[PDB]
Each structure stands twice: as C-alpha cells, then as structure tokens.
Design a protein around this ligand. Structure first.
Ligand SMILES: *[C@@H]1O[C@H](CO)[C@@H](O)[C@H](O)[C@H]1NC(C)=O
Ligand SMILES: *[C@@H]1O[C@H](CO)[C@@H](O)[C@H](O)[C@H]1NC(C)=O
Ligand SMILES: *[C@@H]1O[C@H](CO)[C@@H](O)[C@H](O)[C@H]1NC(C)=O
Ligand SMILES: *[C@@H]1O[C@H](CO)[C@@H](O)[C@H](O)[C@H]1NC(C)=O
Ligand SMILES: *[C@@H]1O[C@H](CO)[C@@H](O)[C@H](O)[C@H]1NC(C)=O
Ligand SMILES: *[C@@H]1O[C@H](CO)[C@@H](O)[C@H](O)[C@H]1NC(C)=O
Lengths: 173, 326, 325, 172, 330, 172
C-alpha cells in the first residue's frame, strides 16, 4: 500500500467490523470488539461519492455518430466522417479507461492514508503507556477501561493518569 | 494485557478493479459505470412510434411506388426504420438526384403531410390518364406509376403544347416535392409520346432555377426499360412560389408533402414492439442508469456515452483482504 | 507552564472556493482563475488594422458592385470583415451566384483587394455597352443602373448580335478574383429584342478552367420586378493565366475585377459597433482583453485568444485549505 | 486531510502567520508568536507555480471554429462540421474541468504533506527534550530561549545541550 | 564506534532528466523514452509488396496511357503509390479530368489493376480509328501519338460522322475502371473537318449511371500548342453491369481499361521524391520508414502500415526510477 | 520530496547499493555494506512496469491522417479536414504531454513513499534500542552482528533480546 498500512504493516481486514471502512478493535477484561470510526469513515464516503459523481457529471456529454450515406463520388467526405467519428471514439475510450486506472490507484491510496492517520492518532496519545505489537496493535501497560478505550478513540486519552501504573508495569517486566 | 488495534473493513466480495500500478485487485465496494446490455428491439421514443418502411425503401415511400401504398398519406415518426432487404424503391429505372441529401433532409423530419400540389387539370391539352408502365406494378395492377408523380404524354392528336403550372406556398410549412425528366431510348418513343423537335423542362422559384432536356439513348434494360427517368426533389420554402413550364418529357409533380422539421434512420432487421424507450440504439434499446455504453454509437434519445470499453469499474471501497478461515 | 513550539499553516480572510474530485466548495487561501468571462461588446483593430464594415451591403452586394454599395468601390484592406445581419443590398437583379459559399470562403481568407478594369467596354465589338441597366438595380441617384463590376451587353439598335471576344493575360503576381453572368430572359420576345435570333452561348476559358452556358428561357416568379434571372459566376485567374471570353449573346460581361492578396480569416456576421479601438483577441461577440488561458465568450475569433470551453469557472487552488480562527 | 495534518491533527490554521504557507508558533517567557518556514514555503510556491504554468502551457493550443456557410444541398457536411466542432469543444471542456478537479485535490494534499513533514522535521530534532501533544505542538522539558526557538526553526537545535536539564524535569 | 544501520536508496551515473508538473529537469536513475524521432528517408515494401513508382508520370498520365508512360503500361500490383512532385507526363492534350480528387482517392483504394482492351476499334462503324494523334501527345519515339487507352475517333472522307454504338458487358467479378472523353474544338471549322456538321452528342449509360454531353466550341488559351480542350471522364463499371456508348461525333472512346482489385489494407498515395529500395517495412510514413518499438512518433501523421501515434512532442520520457542524488566526489 | 525521505531527511542516494532501488547500509565489527531490500524494490518494479504498460496500452490507437486532394472549389471541406486532423493532433499531444508530467510527479512520490515506509518499518522494530543519528541512520545501543542486521532487514528483530544491554549502554 503506498502509505504502508493496508495489506502492509497492518496485514488484514476485519470481516468483524461491518459498520465502517476504518476502525478500532479492542480487548479488555470487560470484553472484545470491533468498532468503526464514524468520522473518518463518513468523510471517506462523502469524498468517494463525490468523486464518482464528479466523474459521472464530467462524462455526461455524448458525441453523436450519424447515419448519413455517401455517393460513389463522395469517398473522401465519407472517409472524413468515418475518421472523425472513430477519432472521437478513440479519444473518449482512452479518457475513460485511463481515468479509471488512475483513479482506482488514487482511491486505494486515500483509504490507505486514512487508516495510517488513525493509527498515528492513537500512537501519539498512548506514547510509552503502551507497547507496539505489530499489525497496528497496542498493548496497554496499564489496565484500560471501556471508558479508557473510548477516550483513546474519541481523542480524550489521559496519559498522565495512567503514567505511574504504566511505568511500574512496563519495567517490572 | 489490554489491546487496542487500528484496522480496516473486509468482506466476501470477489469483485476486482484494475489500477495503473496493479491489475486484478479485489476491493470491498465498487461501481461498474458501463452498460453492455440491450433489448434487441425498436421501441417508442417519447411515446411516439417509429415508422416502419417495411418492404419499401425511402425512395419507394417518398416517390410513392405503387407497392408502397400502405405507407401512403400523413406520417409521424420518432425515427425511421428502413428494412435492409426492402425491394420496393425506384421501379422505373433512373437516378434520384442528390439522393443522400434527400435521405438526410427526410431524416431531419418528424412529420409529413401529403397533399395534391398540382392537380392533373393544371396541364392543359396534354394526356393525364396514360402515364403508366410495366416497370411499376402495384400488387393488383401490372402497369401503374408513382402516386406522387404524373407521367404526362401528348394527347391522341399531335401536338404536345407548352404546359404551365404554378403553386404558391401560402403556408407555414416547407413543401417537399418531386419531379422527373423522361429520357427515351429512341427517337421513335420520343416522337410517339411527345410532339417533335427540341423539348425542355424548366422550373423556378425565387431562390432556385432548373432546366433540362431529354437525352435520348438506349441504356441497359432495367425492369424492362432501356429508357431512363431523371428524378429530382426540392423544398419550397414558406412564402415561396413554384413555376413549372414544359413542352415535353415532364414527369410532373402531383402530390407533395408539407414537412415538419435530431432524427435517425435505422437500417435494421429488429422488430418494432409495443414498448417504450428513453434510449434507442440501432442494435437495440438501452434501459440503464450507467454512464457509459458499449452497444452502439448510433442512437436516438438520451443515451450513455459510447466507448469501445469492455468494463469501466471504479473502486469505491478499499482493497479486500479478509481473514482466511479454514 | 512549559514553553512550546507548534507547527502549523496559514489562514486568511479568504472566502474564495475551489472544487476537487473529493470535495466541493473548499475555501482556499490563494487561488487562480483560468477562465475569462468578460468581453468588450465591440469590434476593434487587429494588428493595428481596421476591419471592413460592409454596412448595408452583403458580401455579394460588395464584390459584384451593387450600385447602392458604392462606398466600397475601389481598394480594400481588412483584418476581418463585418457583415451586418440586416444588410439590404446584395444581388439586386434576381438570380443565383454559383458556388456562393466557396466564394464567401475565398474572400474571407484574403487581406486585400485592388479593383481594376479587366475588360474595357471597347473589348466587345459590334454591340451596345451603354444600355445594360435595370430598374431592379437602382443607385441612390438613378432608378435604373447595374453592377459596377459587370457590363450587361445588348444588341446595337440595328441587328445582329455578333460573335464578341476578349482576352486578359494576367501578367502580375497576384490572383484575380472576377465575375460574369448569363442572362436568362422570361420570353423569346425579351430574348429576341435584347439579343439576336438563334442559339446563344457564353463560353469562357483559361489554361485550367472551362465554362459553357446557354440561355434557359422561362418565366420565374417576380423578384424585384423580374421574372428573368441572371446566373452569376466567379472565378480566380492565377498569375500567368489568360482568360478568353467568347459569346453570342446573353453574356453579362466581366468589367472590373480584383487583384486579390491573401493566416486566419474571419467574416463576422454581427451588428456590434466598430469603435476606434485596438485589440489582440477579437471575438464575434466582443473583444477579449485578458491574460487568462480559457474563455467562455465565443469559439469564433481572430487574433491570439484564449481557448474556448463551456465552463463557467476554472479556478486552480494555489494556496491551501482555509481554516481560520 | 490526506496526510492528516491540515484540518486533521492540527485542527486549524493561523491568521496570525502572515508571511508563509507553513509555520511555527512559539510561546515562552519572552513572549509568543508566528514565523514562516521560508524554505519549505518557497519550495511549495516554486512547485505550485510550475504546475500552474505547465497547465497554462499545455492548454496553449486552440481549436478554431470557422463560420463557413453551407447551402441547402450541404446538410451533411454542414452537420459534419457542427458535430466536429462541438466534439472538440466537448473534449477540451472535459479536459479542463477534470484537470482542475484532479489537480485541486492533489495540490491540497501537497500542502498537507508539507505541513506534516515540517512537523516531523521538528519532532526528530526535539526528541525526548520535549513532549509531543496532540496537535502539532511540542511542550519543552526545558527553558527554551528565543535562541533556542530560532535554533529549532533553523534546524540547528542542540539536543545534548538541554538533554540533562530536560531529563530532570521529565522525571521531576 | 557504534553499530549503524541506515535506510536509503539507489543512485547512479545517469544524467538523463525528466519533467514533472512540480519541477523540471529532474535527473532520475531510470527512465523510458516513449517517442520515436528517427526514420529512414526512403520507401520500402509494406506487406512484402513493392509500391508503384510513377517516376516521370503523374497519376493521370499513368491511367490514361500517356504515350510517354508505357513503362507503367502493364498490370500493376502495389502496396501504395509514390508520385514524384515534378513528374512531367500527365494530361498532354489540354483539358480537365473531371472529378479528379475522387479518382485519385479511388485509385488509392486499389491494390492491383489488369489492363485489357475494353472496346476494340472495330466497335465503331463507319468512322476512322487511325487518325487520332496529336503533337501535343508525343511518345518518346513518335512526335504525334495519343493515350494508349483512348481512341480519338475521326470521321472518314465521307462527310458524315455516323451514329456509333458500343456495348461492353461485365460478366466478371471485378469492377472495371474506365475512361472516355468529349472533344471541344477551337473552331466550327475544325469541328466540321474532324466530325460531321450539325448537333453532336456523346451519351453513355449503365444500369446505375447516365451521361450525356455535347461539344462546347471555343478558342481557349494555348496549352501544348492547342487552343482546343478535352473533357476526360472516368467511371467504374460494377460487376454484372453493362456499358452502352452512343455518339454523333466528338467522342474520345474508351479503348483499354482496367480490372480493378480493391484492397483490405488502408491504401495510400505519397507525393514525395524519396528513393524506393528493396527493403521491407512495417510502418511507412511519407517522409520515411519507422523501425521502432515506441508508442509515439514525431516524424509524420501520414503513413501506411502499423505506426506509433503521431504527436508534436520533442520527447516523452517517463520516469521509472527515482531522483538521482549520487554522492559528490572531489 | 513529498514524503520527505528522498532528497529530504535522507539527503543522498548510494551508488554502492547496486542491486536495488531501496535498501540498507550497515556497519558493524564484522564489516560494512550495502544491501537492497528485495521485497520493496521488486513490488515497485512490478508497479512501475504495470504503469508503463498500461500507459502504452491505452495509447495504442492511432488517428490516421490522409493524403486526399481537394479542388479549388473545395476550400471549405479541405479546411474542415485540416482542422479535424490538427484538432486530433492537438488533443493527443496534450494527452501524452500532460500524462507524462503528472505520472512523473506521482512515480517520484511513490519511490519517496517506499523509502519512508522502509525507514518507518525499521524505526518501529528498533524502538529505543537504537539512537537516531541523522539521515535515516540508526546507531545501535548494543552489539548488532550480521544475524542481528539481517534480523532487522527481515522484519524479525528481537527488541527484548537486546533491551537490557541497550538500556545499560543508554545509561552510560
Ligand atoms: C469520550 O470519552 C470520554 C472518556 O470515555 C467520555 O467521558 C466522553 O463522554 C466521550 N464522549 C462522548 C460523550 O461520547
Ligand atoms: C481581507 O484582506 C484584504 C487584504 O488584507 C483586504 O483588502 C480586504 O479588505 C480584507 N477583507 C475584508 C474583511 O474586507
Ligand atoms: C501572357 O503574357 C506573357 C508575357 O507577359 C507571354 O509570355 C505569354 O505568352 C502570354 N500568354 C498568352 C497565352 O497570351
Ligand atoms: C540560527 O540560529 C542561531 C541560534 O542557534 C542564530 O544565532 C542564527 O542567527 C540563526 N541563523 C539564521 C540564518 O537565522
Ligand atoms: C532542461 O534543462 C536543461 C539544462 O538542465 C536545458 O538545456 C533544457 O533546455 C531544459 N529543457 C527542457 C526540454 O525542459
Ligand atoms: C451482360 O451479360 C449477361 C450475361 O450473359 C447478360 O445476362 C446480360 O443480358 C448482359 N446485359 C444485357 C442487358 O444485355
């Protein structure tokens, strides 16, 4: 993946997370679950939808071919019409095919970046209160509440509050 | 210890898209933008039926070939369907001049109103009744002629006098009309049919002039005729006037069309059916919301853009990497 | 309490927006509009050269020498032509100017015409040259005149109409645009009165061109009181080419023609004013005075203009997303 | 934002930073303020300018319509000319409009990338002599003079020089 | 010292550059040039098939049978046609070859023509077929000749030019390309001399075609010592059709004509003075052969065969590698 | 660079690293060397190659101009032909030229990203067992022999294994 998260340092998707594109998986003494991040998911949806609609709108013009006949003394204009029509056809076929290859590449990148940015959003909050396992997972050095998981997700995580417990744990080991 | 993980969506989707970097990439959600599907029939467009010329070509319909009487009269069309194998066209051998331009003008139309432009009475001291030919049978009469033309011949005594006619276009609508010049194979047929000496057909309007005289020679037999007819067409603008003057060889305008003016002429075998379309192509109806189609460049109504493309699938979802379950 | 250094980005009072594939109406700090939607509704000089205003005459009226189009008479230089749409004075004696659109196309591609006398009236011998006028072609001062560039030749008061002949050898460096015609009377009475009895012909030829017409007598509907017609013709005598004219009657003879000198030509059919004014890009609907790279005013222009597109705005973001506090 | 900095972890811009695209804001005992990173701001101006001029340059050909006349026996080539002209009009209209949408999306990501790389450039200097908050801001574990701040901006910040002072407070 | 691991990238001696929207003259490690700008300034065989070189003759001089063009006289098979810009032998008896652009276009369509006698001189009864030569049309061996494919029919000593008739019938599978003419004398005198007196006509017809023309007698500017002109005409007798020829006088009659093979391949006519050699090509432009794998080309828009797309560009170099930032040595 | 690695926080390339686009330079008591990171360079080669072939394939139709002649009564259709042919020439010239500028920018960015992701990958393995020197270089706080190096390159580095040694040296 170009941002390196999707099919990258985060190896796989979650079939379990059915309510979003991007998300959090948590495990705690209370339970374990998959929860989508509403904001990043919705922004991605609004943007991708807009991209599809913009492409559709820019493309809703048509070149119209004609049924006109040409006489045996009209080979040159007849051929002119044919080369003209084929020419526009080739231009538009090219425009759509290339635009689809290009945009598919860029769309997959945009998803990859959104995943990467959520992961970083978490890493900066946790700091050394958690240990980075691979695959985009963090192990807290402290007991983390449901309320605590929510705080990480909604950006409210309190690093000082768990700092002593965490340090004690991190280096008791 | 407690885990929080950051991740992305996965699903059972096996649908793939292509990328500049990569081909066959499975993605969670995607949209196909191109339509490759059609009904193989002709339908109404704007709830207006197409005109089926059936066993007649455009020439056969509009010049009024006698085997095209089913077509005869007023017609209203969303588009014209001309069957490729139609055998009733120009029955009496000759050239319909500026044929392609006529086909284009008829295609620009949506309606024709048939009316008698020059009654047979217009031409005086000449024979109206006679002009008939085995090259133009109806289904009932072996010798007949075009409904929209009169083959004038000299009366039983000599001679063919100067004949004149005028029509003034009082109306709102342009009039599409036809006439001809007869080219006999022989001096014998020429003299038999028309009185002696040099003959002419001359016609005029405010914007147009026409003059021709018979070219007499034998041409290879076509429908039993070594003679030929030169057919001509024109459009009399609203407020314009037509003068016809001739001393021999005139195939006179009889009936003409008030013409009401994008249209298509489809040469196709497809059946017209009791259906509605919003998009109609020469190879069939498109009934789609798609942006692109690969059916046909030639159409009528609102149609998606034509491209040679097999598929145009846009990824909207992310790359699908679901967990392997054994 | 601890000291801080933060990283961040510019923000400004901007309310100017751009669209992207992902989002519409994104306020952005700096941007650049690439499309021009303003024009001066007028015609101006191009390359410091004035346009030719045809005023009340059409192109036909001007180059055939319609008597009411005398203001243009003689030489013309132009950066482009302006034909007023309601112009009244064109072909005054009814009839068809053959290959009209192709003549209109040839003229447009010229810069200048010098009017000269190709065939003096003395060229034709045995015939009257002083009588060929008509009430269909008045000037402003007489009711019966004719095209200045043609001579309507007729029978001298005593029979007959002899074979007339003339030649012009184009010794110059410039092509000659010239005109002639064939008269087609409504009668054999007008035919006999004006020309001889007998079969009339008009034959013209050069090294590369052949022409032959004969009268087609019939009565056509009245236009400007005329049931007769003239078939008018044009052609171009290349440098080094000679024109032989030979006729029996019914020839409307060439009289004055044009040394013709020819980039991109333009005939604007408009009613805008030609003001005292200079320009670099002239559009059929106005002057574009602009540095922008796209325009939505018109696909028809002369000069160096921006590329025409149906868009209403083409604004590139240059700055960034505006998120002020 | 797609690199996540603009309208992302740095929630808003600075009306106060007047002379650059991309910036530093500082607070210390001496005061507080804004200062553009001239080098990255200029490198972005160079890039964007070159893009704008590349677009202008490539769009510097014109298709010319001609109002040639066509007679009543020339409906076909008349219409051929019309479909032809409108065809190129439709292609160039598409080219320009799509190009603008695409490029606008990408230029915004460029700005985002630049802000993000400036942030990372500072972060990697400061290391553990300062605390990365949420928001592109760093809270020093030591006293940061206007020289100190200027040196952070210059890329000449001296990490050992404050290493012990900051270890202390980071513990204390 | 301490143990180091560094992350970095490739560099090399490459001085090749590329442009980007953001930046120009960026030097990169690897790149591909996508445009071709080399040609061989010559004409080669296309589908192992030699082009027709018209040499000193033009297309007209060729298919009318200008007597100075007998080098091209027989059957011809070609992959395209090369016409030298200053070929001197075309229409030698002054006049117009009507619908000429459309003839040049139809000839381009073909890949092969078989010449054959379409109308034997015997066809025309009571007229002289042996006197139709002019000094306007010399062969390289006689100062007075005529097109090898037309008969300038002249009357006999008897004052009458009789009605003459001719039929030909295309029972074969190929269309026949054939020529004819109408003679216009400067004189009523020359007219009288060469043909009858009184109204003259040339009429010809098929199942799909009519033609009638009469003489248009006038003195025109001398060309090849002739103030008289000829109207040449051409047509294509479809398989199964029949040509009927009737005339009163002034007929330049079809004599030899061509069975015409049309072609699946795109066909061309190159006006050019480049040489032709025993070489083979897959792509042939009017200014040269391209021998290339590249996608784009700037040599010409006009070609026959399989050519790269034509563009105005000088160069179309794609970066495949990364920026080249090699270490500075001193 | 947009991702900031190439000609950014890593100033220069290595002529020494002959076998790849992206990779490692290592130094230890056993020796010093350059080794390409095979997996990332091969995936980039695949991507760039597909891009080149995609562009080549999409560009594989040609408009054909023709050598038809026009008479002097044919100025309008001759000109129509010329504008038509030139019009397609301008449209294809634009597509190729614009496409090359855009794809060249994007391909450089992709290389920049692969280098930054490689560096980020190692950085995340190493944690605080290593020190960041400048220029994408880590100095280990412990002995790293060839198997240790290989271990980093592979993705298999053992942070617990060296953590006490690196911590003790970090203290010193
Ligand atoms: C965000 O997290 C904090 C900690 O869980 C919680 O108290 C707060 O209510 C959350 N926001 C809401 C209201 O969802
Ligand atoms: C915003 O700034 C420009 C220049 O500072 C100024 O001309 C304009 O008046 C300002 N907008 C407002 C609030 O009027
Ligand atoms: C025309 O004039 C040139 C010299 O002015 C002369 O050489 C040429 O023969 C003339 N052409 C004819 C046929 O009169
Ligand atoms: C860079 O920072 C130092 C303080 O560390 C300062 O004295 C110097 O003038 C600065 N250089 C520039 C170019 O501003
Ligand atoms: C590119 O740069 C070189 C110098 O580095 C210069 O000679 C050339 O003109 C520039 N040209 C192009 C084609 O961009
Ligand atoms: C031409 O030849 C065919 C084959 O014999 C014959 O059927 C046809 O009658 C001929 N054409 C005419 C009309 O004689």
């Amino acid at each position: 993946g170009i941002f390196g998260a999707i099919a990258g340092f985060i190896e796989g998707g979650w079939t379990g997370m059915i309510d979003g594109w991007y998300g959090y998986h948590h495990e705690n003494s209370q339970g374990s679950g998959y929860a989508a991040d509403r904001e990043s998911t919705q922004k991605a949806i609004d943007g991708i939808t807009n991209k599809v609609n913009s492409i559709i709108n820019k493309m809703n013009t048509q070149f119209e071919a004609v049924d006109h006949e040409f006489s045996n003394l009209e080979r040159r204009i007849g051929n002119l019409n044919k080369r003209m029509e084929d020419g526009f056809l080739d231009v538009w076929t090219y425009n759509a095919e290339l635009l689809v290859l290009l945009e598919n590449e860029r769309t997959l990148d945009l998803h990859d970046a959104n995943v990467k940015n959520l992961y970083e959003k978490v890493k900066s909050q946790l700091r050394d209160n958690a240990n980075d396992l691979g695959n985009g997972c963090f192990e807290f050095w402290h007991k983390c509440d449901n309320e605590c998981m929510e705080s990480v997700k909604n950006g409210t995580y309190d690093y000082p509050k768990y700092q002593k417990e965490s340090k004690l744990n991190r280096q008791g080991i | 210890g407690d885990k929080i993980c950051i991740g992305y969506h996965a699903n059972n989707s096996t649908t793939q898209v292509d990328t500049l970097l990569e081909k066959n990439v499975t993605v969670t959600h995607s949209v196909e933008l191109l339509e490759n599907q059609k009904e193989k029939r002709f339908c109404k467009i704007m709830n207006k039926a197409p005109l089926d010329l059936k066993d007649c070509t455009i020439e056969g319909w509009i010049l009024g070939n006698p085997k095209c009487d089913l077509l005869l009269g007023d017609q209203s069309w969303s588009y014209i369907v001309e069957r490729p194998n139609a055998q009733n066209g120009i029955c009496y051998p000759g050239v319909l001049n500026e044929l392609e331009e006529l086909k284009a003008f008829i295609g620009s139309g949506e309606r024709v109103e048939r009316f008698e432009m020059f009654p047979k009475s217009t031409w005086a001291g000449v024979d109206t009744s006679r002009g008939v030919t085995n090259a133009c049978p109806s289904y009932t009469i072996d010798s007949s002629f075009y409904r929209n033309l009169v083959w004038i011949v000299k009366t039983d005594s000599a001679t063919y006098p100067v004949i004149k006619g005028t029509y003034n276009n009082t109306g709102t609508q342009p009039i599409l009309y036809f006439w001809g010049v007869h080219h006999p194979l022989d001096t014998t047929v020429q003299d038999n049919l028309y009185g002696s000496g040099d003959k002419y057909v001359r016609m005029g309007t405010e914007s147009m002039n026409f003059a021709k005289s018979p070219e007499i020679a034998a041409r290879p037999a076509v429908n039993g005729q070594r003679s030929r007819i030169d057919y001509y067409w024109s459009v009399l603008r609203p407020g314009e006037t037509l003068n016809v003057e001739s001393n021999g060889n005139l195939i006179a305008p009889w009936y003409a069309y008030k013409f009401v003016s994008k249209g298509a002429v489809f040469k196709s075998d497809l059946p017209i059916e009791n259906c509605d379309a919003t998009c109609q192509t020469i190879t069939g109806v498109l009934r789609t919301n798609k942006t692109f189609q690969n059916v046909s460049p030639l159409w009528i109504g609102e149609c998606p853009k034509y491209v040679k493309s097999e598929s145009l699938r846009l990824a909207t979802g992310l790359r699908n990497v679901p967990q392997i379950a054994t």
